[PDB]
Structures are given as C-alpha cells and as structure tokens.
Amino acid sequence: GSHMANKAVNDFILAMNYDKKKLLTHQGESIENRFIKEGNQLPDEFVVIERKKRSLSTNTSDISVTATNDSRLYPGALLVVDETLLENNPTLLAVDRAPMTYSIDLPGLASSDSFLQVEDPSNSSVRGAVNDLLAKWHQDYGQVNNVPARMQYEKITAHSMEQLKVKFGSDFEKTGNSLDIDFNSVHSGEKQIQIVNFKQIYYTVSVDAVKNPGDVFQDTVTVEDLKQRGISAERPLVYISSVAYGRQVYLKLETTSKSDEVEAAFEALIKGVKVAPQTEWKQILDNTEVKAVILGGDPSSGARVVTGKVDMVEDLIQEGSRFTADHPGLPISYTTSFLRDNVVATFQNSTDYVETKVTAYRNGDLLLDHSGAYVAQYYITWDELSYDHQGKEVLTPKAWDRNGQDLTAHFTTSIPLKGNVRNLSVKIRECTGLAWEWWRTVYEKTDLPLVRKRTISIWGTTLYPQVEDKVEND
DSSP states (O other): OOHHHHHHHHHHHHTOOOOHHHHTEEEOOOOOOOEEEEEEEETTEEEEEEEEEEEEEEEESOEEOOOSSOSSOSTTOEEEOSHHHHTTOOOBOOSOBOOEEEEEEOTTOOSSTTEEEESSOOHHHHHHHHHHHHHHHIIIIITTSOOBOEEEEEEEEOOOHHHHHHHHOTTHHHHHHHTTOOHHHHHTTSOEEEEEEEEEEEEEEEEOOOSSGGGGBOTTOOHHHHHHTTOSSSSOEEEEEEEEEEEEEEEEEEEOOOOTTHHHHHHHHHHTOOOOTTOSHHHHHTTOEEEEEEESOSSSOSEEEEEEOTHHHHHHHHHTSBOOTTSOOEEEEEEEEETTTOOBOOEEEEEEEEEEEEEEEEOEEEEEEEOOSSOEEEEEEEEEEEEOTTSOEEEEEEEOTTTTOOBOSSEEEEEEEOTTEEEEEEEEEEEOSSSSSOEEEEEEEEEEOOOSEEEEEEEEOSSSEEEEEEEOOO
C-alpha cells in the first residue's frame, strides 16, 4: 500500500478545526409565548384546561434507532457530520476500510473470545461475525443458563411531535406514525397520552479508540477521494464506537380520564403495581387503550404494531426479558466519536411545545322531594365558574327559575348542576298558615359541596316540618 497517501489523509484529518458543539446542535420549533386557561363543558363533567410554554432540552450521546434494516448502523462505521446525522439519517462514508476488532459483552464468556476481528467492516461483515459467536455462546451458556436482559424505562407525556423527537430521537417520527398519537385530542384537553419506551439489551458491540485517523482506511483512500465526497472541516467524520443490540418497545397509553393520578396510575402500570379493584386508578386504567411498536421481539427481525388493553402491557414487557441466542436482536442504540480525537459526539437537542394540563369537575344532580302538608318555597342560587382568558376565576350568579314559587306535595324535581357550579345555597321555607309567623324556614345551607346527587326531602306538617339532606358522593 501507498504509505504517503495514508500519511496525507491522516494529517488532512488532524488538521481539521471545527466547533463540535455547533455541528451537533439541533433546534426544533420556536413558538410565540403562550398561556390559556379554558373551561370546557362535556356531557358528564366540566374540564378546566391549562396551556403553557415549556421547552425540552437534552444533551445525548446515545442515539436511538427505530430502523429495522439500516445497513449504515454497524459498529465502526464512518458517518459524515452534517444535518442528516442530526436527523438520524446518516451519510455513510463507504470507502476501502482497514480491519477492525470489536469487543462484545455477553455473560460467562472468556474475554479473549469477547473479541471479533473483521477484515472489511460492513454491516454484512460484523453481523456475520457476531452471529458466528452468538451461535456458539448459545449452546454453552444461552440455552444452558438463565440470562436476564438489561432493561431501561423512559416515559414522557405526549404534547407535541417535535417534543417527542427531542425525548426519543429525531427518527421517532416513523414510530410515532404507527402509534396513531392524536395531539389535537390532547390539546383539546379531552385525552391524556403517555409514551413509554422499553429497551431490553442483549449485548453491546464496541470498538477500541482510534489512534490515528488514517488507521480506519486502506492505503488506497486518498485525500481527494475524501474531498470528492464533500469531506472537510465544515463536514467532518465521526465513527460508531458502540451499538446496543436487543429488543425495544414504543408504547402509547391513551385515556379519557382527567384525574390527578392518570400519571400515577400509568406509573403504577409500568412499575408492575398490583392495582386494587376499585381505585380511580383502575377506573382510568380500564378506560385506557394501548398501542405498541415492537422491534426485534422474535426470531423475525421486524416491527410489530399492536393494539390492546393495559393487560397487554405486562406481556410485552416479559417476552423479551430473557435472552437466549435463539434470536440475535436488532440495534436499538448507538454512539459516535469523532475520528480526529475520539471525543464522544453529544447532540444538544431542544424544542418549544405547548404543554396542556387538565382538571375535571364531575357534574352533579340536586333532587328535591316535597311531600309535606304545607305550601313550600325554594330559594336555590349558585355561581357558575368561568375564566377570563387573561386567566383569573370569574363567578357568575345563577338562580333556579322556580325560586319563590309556591309548591305543594307531591313535588319532585331534579336540577342538573354542571361541574362549574360553585357556592350552591339552598333555602326552603313553608307557610305555617298563621299570622305573627307566616313563613318558617325549614332548611338553609350556604356553600353546599358540589356532589353527584343530593336529595333534599321535606315532609311533616306546618307546625312540625322535617328535613332530610341525603348525599352519595361516588
């Protein structure tokens, strides 16, 4: 080989000066500052909506991969540092490449056989070498022993698609396509959506550090071949220094409860909490549907998109949990170091998103039973809560349109009361039929708690009226 060509290439790369942080900075969406407080009425409940500005920013050397069959993502590959790397759509610098040895971490292997030497690094060559050793490890230790996988849990509330790609990588968009996340329904304040990512790592494959940038090419590669491909200081080289292989699950939790503890119940499901027969957690969990994308779940190297109830969550967690080398698994994350100095490439990703949090107030009924031997009058008032879009509480006075009207037994009515009713007050008086005290208050309460039904029953006589206030808050 022509030593002088490999000498020039090597100096060409060591001479590259560039700002690492600017090349790896990815900014998503800028949005004008926001704040809304919107009450919305629904058939059985009144919902208070909040919408604010937040931003998610992550410094990440770990690149997650959705891609089932990408040939560019093998350990030791050379990727170009440009805008397509930021989107996990890397330009592959495919030239004549020097041999490389990898180190693989699997249980109960001699560390000499933890090394795999490849003549010509390519996705075809490394998987071919890794599979050769997985087959031997499987018979001596895989089928023979019980090896757990390394599990990892990341969760986040779904608010925007750009916000999800900051959390889960720019490639998340494809996986998001399948999960049929609908943010319109989240912004409408009606639904709450969590996204869960599950990794089960079977093994990692890594390369030693590179002592000279020229060490990765054969002597045939020339500086002009690199310049021919647009390689320069503005557009420099990086190499994949480790790849995690295994199985992973992207999972959507979609529900219509607006409860405080939707997050707590969702957390409880992920932790494996044996949730209790009539919590509110179980009420919302039995109104939650689950969509899941599964990568590398079975001997078939492919992607499964499934729909089901939350009972499906325990079973998806568990099938990949144990690693025999029956299945090689697929690349689930990888790391890149600069060729020039082996510094790890760390991406600074950020975006603005509209955060929508939500409150619910259930609607109530007020039942009135008048079976008394007297004319009775009801005085029922309340306030209905609304928000000026500045954002403060506004109370508007309301009254029952039958207030002050003489009522006789047997009277029965039901007054529906929306979830925005505040300060319910109720006064019942009855005619005694004699001067000096003609009306006699039978019942008077202020600021009654908004409750699902309330039954106020009056009976008895003009001189001896009785009252019953019955409540059943569920």
